[PDB]
Structure 1
Amino acid sequence: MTGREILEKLERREFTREVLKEALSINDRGFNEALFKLADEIRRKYVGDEVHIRAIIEFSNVCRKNCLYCGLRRDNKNLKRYRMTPEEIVERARLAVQFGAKTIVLQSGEDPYXMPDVISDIVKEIKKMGVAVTLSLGEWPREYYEKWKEAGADRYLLRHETANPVLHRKLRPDTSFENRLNCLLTLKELGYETGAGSMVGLPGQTIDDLVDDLLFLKEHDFDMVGIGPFIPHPDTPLANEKKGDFTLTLKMVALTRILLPDSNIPATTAMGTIVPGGREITLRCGANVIMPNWTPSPYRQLYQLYPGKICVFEKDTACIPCVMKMIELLGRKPGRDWGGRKRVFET
């Protein structure tokens, strides 16, 4: 079909595999710009002009897993490992709340040391501050997720990475797509607001794989969807592979908004790493969330999932003010509340 025809089907919500494949395969500038406009408009209509700020503290770069794409993979000996103390994490969260953060995201490698009880203790202390707590700690037993929910955690981010089970197992040799999905289903069952999402441009990933990622997200109706380009890391087996394409990744974000109009969708730091101003573009093509880095020195520079991260040389407290300026210059507003999902039930 022509681009005009694909757009019309998207506007009528005929979200067929064929329509999604064609949307991702067409490279016409006019088509792409119309797609981005559509996603921007849907975002405005369903989630408004508030951009929700989630302050992220990357509190440990220790990891037991060996994901082929990730700089924190256990086989990477060329990385100084660190662990923030629970007191450091709590006080760093407190500083973020003092700076106006209404959600605190705790992210780490899969570091056994903290699991589950130290995390629970930290979550309890941060919840006293009257903010939302989101965890992004990887794959753990149901019992750990249960304990963290009881401790007061609100949300959990666990990107599905790739919905192709063969590619998933190759890239993540400690685990499987089946495991990843089971974690996500468990998190939802436990009452977390649950985030999934994927990387774009992984080695061996196809356009049909991207369509499958979109259909998977639509199937499970996730509260949050985190999408970024694959960025090769020099100290990993994928060092010499091609980076994901910014425009294709942007189309995935746009299509995600169109498919899941009331979801929360970040403009990820990976988008701003591969293209200067990439986050700002992404906030205008369907995204409505930003995650300023709140990891303190000297640890921020050591949390290297991928290289070149833009947040690294800035002062400890720079990123919250930075994103507030960003939000204003985009003609948007900061979030007024915790920015939980506001479901619009439809047909």
Structure 2
Amino acid sequence: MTGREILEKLERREFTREVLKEALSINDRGFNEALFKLADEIRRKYVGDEVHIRAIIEFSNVCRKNCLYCGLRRDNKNLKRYRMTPEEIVERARLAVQFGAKTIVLQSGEDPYXMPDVISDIVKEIKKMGVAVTLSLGEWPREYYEKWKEAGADRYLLRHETANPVLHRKLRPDTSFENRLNCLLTLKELGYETGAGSMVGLPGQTIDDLVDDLLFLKEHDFDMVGIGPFIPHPDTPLANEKKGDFTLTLKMVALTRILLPDSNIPATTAMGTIVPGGREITLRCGANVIMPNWTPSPYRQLYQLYPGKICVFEKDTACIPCVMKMIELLGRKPGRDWGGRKRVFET
């Protein structure tokens, strides 16, 4: 098909494997710009001009897993490890709420120390502040997820990473795609607003794999989808592999908006790391959420999933005001409520 014909099929919601493959394979500038415009319009029509701010506290970089792409992998001995205390985490969340955050995101490596009860205690304290709580702690037993839901957690982010089970097992040797999916299904069953998503440009990953990611997201109708480029980290086995392409990753965000028009989709920090102004671009191509870094000094620079992460050298209260300025200069508005998914039922 020509670019014009693929756009017309996307506009009529004929989301076949062939249409998605062709959309990802065409490199024409006119086609790409029209795809980005379509996603931007679908975003405005379905989720409006509000950009929801999720203040993220990366509270521990301790991890038991050995994911091949990740700087926090347990075999990385060249990383200073840290843990915030429960009191530090609560008080830091309180500061974010004082600065206007309406969602607090707690993210960490898979650090057993806190699980499950210290997390439960922390969640209960933050929920007293009248904001949404989102967890991003990795793979744990159903019983842990249940306890956190009972403690008041609202949402859980657990990117599926790659929907190719063979590639998944190789990159994430402690676990499997089956396990990841079982975790996501359990979270949904428990009533969490659930987030999935993937990296783009992983070693071994093909365009067909990317199409399968899109199809997987459509199949499960996730509330949130987090997408970023793979960024090689020098203290990992993938150090010499090629970085993910920004434009290809941007096309994955645009298609995700087109496929899931009422979902919440972040402009991820990885997008801002690989291209200056990458998050702003992404907010104009389908994204409607941003997650300013609220990890306190002196730990920001130690949370090194990937190198060169933006904002790590700044005073640690910088990013909430910064994203508020960003939202304004984009001609957008800040979120007025917790920014939960507002489903638009259709055919």
Report how many residues are paired: 347
| Pairwise CA distance, 1:229 | 0.1
Offset from partner CA, 1:55-101 (integer Å, 9 cap, x none): 00000000000000000000000000000000000000000000000
Equivalent-residue separation in structure 2 for 1:320 and 1:176 (angstroms): 36
SS in 2 for 1:46: helix
Offset from partner CA, 1:263-312 (integer Å, 9 cap, x none): 00000000000000000000000000000000000000000000000020
Percent of aligned pairs with the same amino acid: 100
SS in 2 for 1:214: helix
Q: Which residue of structure 2 lines up, in the alignment, with residue 63 of structure 1? A: 63
SS in 1 for 2:27: coil
Equivalent-residue separation in structure 1 for 2:3 and 2:230 (angstroms): 27
Offset from partner CA, 1:120-159 (integer Å, 9 cap, x none): 0000000000000000000000000000000000000000
| Pairwise CA distance, 1:11 | 0.2
SS in 1 for 2:203: coil
| Pairwise CA distance, 1:47 | 0.1
Equivalent-residue separation in structure 2 for 1:90 and 1:192 (angstroms): 21
SS in 1 for 2:338: coil
Equivalent-residue separation in structure 1 for 2:108 and 2:83 (angstroms): 9
SS in 2 for 1:45: helix
SS in 2 for 1:250: helix
Equivalent-residue separation in structure 1 for 2:105 and 2:270 (angstroms): 17
Report matched runs for 1:122-271 at 5 Å. 122-271=122-271
Q: Does 1:323 align with 2:323?
A: yes
Q: TM-score, normalised by structure 2?
A: 1.00
Question: Which stretches in structure 1 are left out of the alignment for 5+ residues?
Answer: none
SS in 2 for 1:63: coil
SS in 2 for 1:168: helix
Offset from partner CA, 1:165-186 (integer Å, 9 cap, x none): 0000000000000000000000
SS in 2 for 1:216: helix
Offset from partner CA, 1:214-272 (integer Å, 9 cap, x none): 00000000000000000000000000000000000000000000000000000000000
Q: TM-score, normalised by structure 1?
A: 1.00
Equivalent-residue separation in structure 2 for 1:92 and 1:242 (angstroms): 36
Equivalent-residue separation in structure 1 for 2:255 and 2:201 (angstroms): 16
Q: Which residue of structure 1 lines up, in the alignment, with residue 280 of structure 2? A: 280
Aligned Cα RMSD in Å? 0.2
SS in 2 for 1:138: coil
Question: Runs in 1 of length 4+ with deviation above 6 angstroms?
Answer: none
Equivalent-residue separation in structure 1 for 2:233 and 2:33 (angstroms): 31
Offset from partner CA, 1:19-42 (integer Å, 9 cap, x none): 000000000000000000000000
Equivalent-residue separation in structure 2 for 1:329 and 1:308 (angstroms): 25
Equivalent-residue separation in structure 1 for 2:195 and 2:314 (angstroms): 28
